[PDB]
Amino acid sequence: SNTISEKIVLMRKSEYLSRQQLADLTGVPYGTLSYYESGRSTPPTDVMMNILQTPQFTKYTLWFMTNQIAPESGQIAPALAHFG
Amino acid sequence: SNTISEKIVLMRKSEYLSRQQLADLTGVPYGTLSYYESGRSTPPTDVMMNILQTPQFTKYTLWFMTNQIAPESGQIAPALAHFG
Ligand code: NA
Ligand code: NA
C-alpha cells in the first residue's frame, strides 16, 4: 500500500529516471515534482494525467489510480513496489 | 478530446447515474461533484482515485487518465464518448 507521493517515486525509480529527467519528460517543473514526491503538494488531476501520459508511466496507470493491474494489456506495478 | 469535466459527465451518464447517485456511491459530496462537472473545480488526484475506484468507474481508468483503452482487460471508454 503506497501514498501518491510514494507511488510517483516508485514509478520514477523503477524507470531509472532522475527527478530532472522526469521534469524534462513531463514539463512539470522540478520544484513542483519535488513537492509531489515529498507529499507536500497533491497533483491536480490534469497534472497527474500529464505524468501518466509520459510514455513510460502509462503502463502504471491502473495500478497508480486503482491499485489493480492487468499485465495481459501491459498494465503493471513498478518493479520496486514489490506489488502482490 | 474531452476535458476532465466532460469526462466525468460522460462516465456518470454512461453508467446511468444521477449526480446524487454518484455522490452516494463515491462518497464525494454532491456540491464537489457539481463543481467537477462544471469545471469550477479540478479534482485533486486522491479524490480522482476515489472516483475511479468506485466499482463501475474502474473500467474507465485508462481512458480517463491517458485517452487509451484495453477492452481485453475490461478497460473501455464510456459509451457516450463515441471514442474512436
Ligand atoms: Na536515469
Ligand atoms: Na440512475
Considering its fold, how many domains does chain A have in total? 1
Give the CATH number, domain containing residue A8. 1.10.260.40
Torsion (CA) B5, B69, B15, B2 in degrees, nearest 10: 20
Cα–ligand 2 centroid distance for A48 (angstroms)? 30
What angle in degrees, to the nearest 10, is found between the helix axes of B4-14 and B30-38?
Answer: 120
Residue with cell 486522491: B46
Contact check, Cβ <8 Å, A43/B44: yes
Identify the experimental approach.
Answer: X-ray
**Which residues are B10's β-sheet partners?**
none
Cα–ligand 1 centroid distance for B74 (angstroms)? 33
The whole-angstrom separation of Cα B5 and Cα B11 is 10
How big is chain B, counted in residues?
A: 84
Domain that holds residue B39: 1-84
- Picking from B42, B55, B45, the residue whose alpha carbon sits closest to that of residue B15 is B55
Q: Does B61 touch chain A (CB under 8 A)?
A: yes
